[PDB]
């Protein structure tokens, strides 16, 4: 009843952004939407002029620094399926170091954000990568459990078949995992990116 | 301490706003960064770890634990160099020259570990099957030949990568 | 899993109770849309008002207090600390299924689990003040 | 240690005495590892000595 605000030009034209003056680092200013309205309060009614700047986050930094190390760690863990089953300390080193690296990435992912109590897409991706790495570790553990004799193939021996000195056969678990784990990880990546990028 | 002022410039003009034109003076400096700090901090560990990664070629194929420890430690050191770099920079969305160099070094150590895995798979994986059945690339049956080929190729490829990187970014 | 009752007290600085007396209106404290609030780690349960008289050297002052009840949200800390610690404990359990002849493998597994648990221990307390009691 | 050596100092463009000390120590470590690689290259038989 005392003071009323309005836009000089039309509301869209009354909020102008300078072309060169864009100080955003990891955001794209798609545009602005302008509006005017009223608000109630214990003191009375007030005319309030509102603007809304629409900002889309830039995924390049996170793709470089979090998602891609996670994928490389997953691939590193899955590489363990190709070494011989008698390479117990080596495959244990793969599993242990990959799990530690994924734990470190999980810890460092939350640093960029505020301490919100809900789970994000990055958190779900890290969780699934951790599940894949831990699954590879348990796969190696089962392979070692089913390993019969603890000495590897000499190389010169003419191995007999599978229906003197005997040798272990190539693990069926390893043979299946070599084609199962990368395929499942790729399908998960496809589903995740298709779900999240298009929205 | 970091930069050096290559030159400075003065400009006078008129800038136009909705209210009207106004006078404008601009004092600009063209700063050029110094590379000694980065050479000491990020690069030189990266190259030295890259030479560290190639020691696995000279170790015998049967000694699996040594080569695996070497490869995994090199990957870990590349990752910790990268994270201790990115902790002190803004969240820019595009790859920098130092990021490209770190990715190249990471790729090199990754190929070192992967070609060790390939040698192990050739020996222990295809070995019994082949036995029951019974620069140019090497023959894919002789692990010693594969190791020699890696020995002579990895330094050459790394030197070529460094050459193109420096001649492009300098 | 902590719930706090944070106060907000105000009174007249110079005028004692004999000079100025504060009183709450019927609609004392009004809370608006509580979804546009900066509270990330806490959830607002409710609030209450109180009035008291505080004895000081200068005189007696009518102090009006508003308490806000805040309950912590454990989702973030569950992601940060609880889940990795349990996963590392399971990683330690995985050492049992390894063949006992794999001495370096099992020793490396155990010691690395100890490393990660110590790291998580020191990292869990970064967000907290340096209090001298067990949480 | 080399990465965390100069956290507090300004990003100067010259090597300090601490930098030279760190470089020489890392050179010693790298030389030790190369020496071990050389020694292992001339290990003919891969079984240790029995009591
Ligand atoms: C850091 O980055 C900034 C931003 O890019 C750099 O700043 C720019 O520097 C250049 C010079 O290096 C500046 O260019 C000039 O402007 C001056 C002053 O001009 C103004 O006044 C004129 C007279 O009042 C007016 O006519 C101009 O108007 C437009 O007019 C001309 C002619 O119609 C037109 O062609 C232009 O498009 C102008 O936009 C303007 O309002 C001017 O004197 C300079 O002229 C030089 O070039 C002419 C050749 O045509 C030559 O004959 C002259 O003798 C003179 O040599 C030049 O046009 C520019 O304005 C700066 N921009 C900003 C935003 O500051 C800065 O240089 C960078 N740092 C470093 C260290 O380089
Ligand atoms: C979470 C817990 C899960 C528990 C999972 C438990 C999974 C499970 O129970 O594995 C059983 C077995 C393992 O296969 P596996 O390669 O280890 O087969 C044994 C192994 O090859 C030994 O080496 C053989 O002795 P030898 O060296 O020749 O002397 C032995 O033959 P023999 O001594 O009899 O002559 C074989 O039994 O069969 C599968 O392939 C699993 C397919 C599904 C794998 C799916 C992988 C995706
Ligand atoms: C804030 O304080 C006032 C005064 O202490 C409380 O007032 C009472 O409110 C109830 C409910 O409206 C009335 O029935 C009482 O008569 C009021 N008090 C008096 C002295 O008249 C008020 O409820 C408090 N608000 C809270 C607790 O949120
Ligand atoms: C990293 C290059 C050094 C590796 C050791 C080479 C030993 C050669 C002995 C003939
Ligand atoms: C997500 C784990 C997949 C395991 C496939 C055997
Ligand atoms: C979830 C781990 C499965 C390992 C292969 C049986
Ligand atoms: C951080 C390493 C990324 C490697 C991409 C090829
Ligand atoms: C098939 C993997 C090859 C690794 C580089 C020689
Ligand atoms: Cl920003």
Swiss-Prot record, chain A:
Stretches assigned to the Extracellular side: 111-120
Residue ranges annotated as Cytoplasmic topological domain: 84-88
Transmembrane domains' residue ranges: 63-83, 89-110, 121-142, 176-195
Residue positions binding 3alpha-hydroxy-5alpha-pregnan-11,20-dione: 82
Family: Belongs to the ligand-gated ion channel (TC 1.A.9) family. Gamma-aminobutyric acid receptor (TC 1.A.9.5) subfamily. GABRA1 sub-subfamily.
Domain notes: The extracellular domain contributes to synaptic contact formation.
UniProt disease annotation: Epilepsy, childhood absence 4: A subtype of idiopathic generalized epilepsy characterized by an onset at age 6-7 years, frequent absence seizures (several per day) and bilateral, synchronous, symmetric 3-Hz spike waves on EEG. Tonic-clonic seizures often develop in adolescence. Absence seizures may either remit or persist into adulthood. Epilepsy, idiopathic generalized 13: A disorder characterized by recurring generalized seizures in the absence of detectable brain lesions and/or metabolic abnormalities. Generalized seizures arise diffusely and simultaneously from both hemispheres of the brain. Seizure types include juvenile myoclonic seizures, absence seizures, and generalized tonic-clonic seizures.
Assembly and interaction partners: Heteropentamer, formed by a combination of alpha (GABRA1-6), beta (GABRB1-3), gamma (GABRG1-3), delta (GABRD), epsilon (GABRE), rho (GABRR1-3), pi (GABRP) and theta (GABRQ) subunits, each subunit exhibiting distinct physiological and pharmacological properties. Interacts with UBQLN1. Interacts with TRAK1. Interacts with KIF21B. Identified in a complex of 720 kDa composed of LHFPL4, NLGN2, GABRA1, GABRB2, GABRG2 and GABRB3. Interacts with LHFPL4. Interacts with NLGN2. Interacts with SHISA7; interaction leads regulation of GABAAR trafficking, channel deactivation kinetics and pharmacology.
Name of the protein in question: Gamma-aminobutyric acid receptor subunit alpha-1
Organism: Homo sapiens
Complete-protein stretch covered: 192 to 445 of 456
Swiss-Prot record, chain B:
Compartments it resides in: Postsynaptic cell membrane; Cell membrane; Cytoplasmic vesicle membrane
Positions annotated to bind benzamidine: 17
Transmembrane segments: 39-59, 64-84, 97-120, 146-168
Variant or mutagenesis effect after changing residue 9 to H: Found in a subject suffering from insomnia; functional analysis reveals a slower rate of the fast phase of desensitization compared with alpha1beta3gamma2S GABA(A) receptors; current deactivation is faster in the mutated receptors
Positions with a binding annotation for histamine: 19
All ranges on the Extracellular side of the membrane: 85-96, 169-170
Source taxon at top rank: Eukaryota
Residues on Cytoplasmic side: 60-63
Residues annotated for 4-aminobutanoate binding in this entry: 19
Domain notes: GABAARs subunits share a common topological structure: a peptide sequence made up of a long extracellular N-terminal, four transmembrane domains, intracellular or cytoplasmic domain located between the third and the fourth transmembrane domains.
Linked pathology: Epilepsy, childhood absence 5: A subtype of idiopathic generalized epilepsy characterized by an onset at age 6-7 years, frequent absence seizures (several per day) and bilateral, synchronous, symmetric 3-Hz spike waves on EEG. Tonic-clonic seizures often develop in adolescence. Absence seizures may either remit or persist into adulthood. Developmental and epileptic encephalopathy 43: A form of epileptic encephalopathy, a heterogeneous group of severe early-onset epilepsies characterized by refractory seizures, neurodevelopmental impairment, and poor prognosis. Development is normal prior to seizure onset, after which cognitive and motor delays become apparent. DEE43 inheritance is autosomal dominant.
Family: Belongs to the ligand-gated ion channel (TC 1.A.9) family. Gamma-aminobutyric acid receptor (TC 1.A.9.5) subfamily. GABRB3 sub-subfamily.
Protein name: Gamma-aminobutyric acid receptor subunit beta-3
Full protein segment contained here: 209 to 472 of 473
UniProtKB/Swiss-Prot annotation, chain C:
Domain of life: Eukaryota
Glycosylation-annotated residues: 49
Processing and modification events after translation: Palmitoylated by ZDHHC3/GODZ; required for the accumulation of GABA(A) receptors at the postsynaptic membrane of inhibitory GABAergic synapses.
Residue ranges annotated as Extracellular topological domain: 125-135
Cytoplasmic side: 99-104
Subcellular location: Postsynaptic cell membrane; Cell membrane; Cell projection, Dendrite; Cytoplasmic vesicle membrane
Stretches that traverse the bilayer: 78-98, 105-124
Record: disease: Developmental and epileptic encephalopathy 74: A form of epileptic encephalopathy, a heterogeneous group of severe early-onset epilepsies characterized by refractory seizures, neurodevelopmental impairment, and poor prognosis. Development is normal prior to seizure onset, after which cognitive and motor delays become apparent. DEE74 is an autosomal dominant form with onset in the first year of life. Epilepsy, childhood absence 2: A subtype of idiopathic generalized epilepsy characterized by an onset at age 6-7 years, frequent absence seizures (several per day) and bilateral, synchronous, symmetric 3-Hz spike waves on EEG. Tonic-clonic seizures often develop in adolescence. Some individuals manifest febrile seizures. Absence seizures may either remit or persist into adulthood.
Family note: Belongs to the ligand-gated ion channel (TC 1.A.9) family. Gamma-aminobutyric acid receptor (TC 1.A.9.5) subfamily. GABRG2 sub-subfamily.
Written domain comment of the UniProt record: The extracellular domain contributes to synaptic contact formation.
Protein name in UniProt: Gamma-aminobutyric acid receptor subunit gamma-2
Record organism: Homo sapiens
Gene coding for it: GABRG2
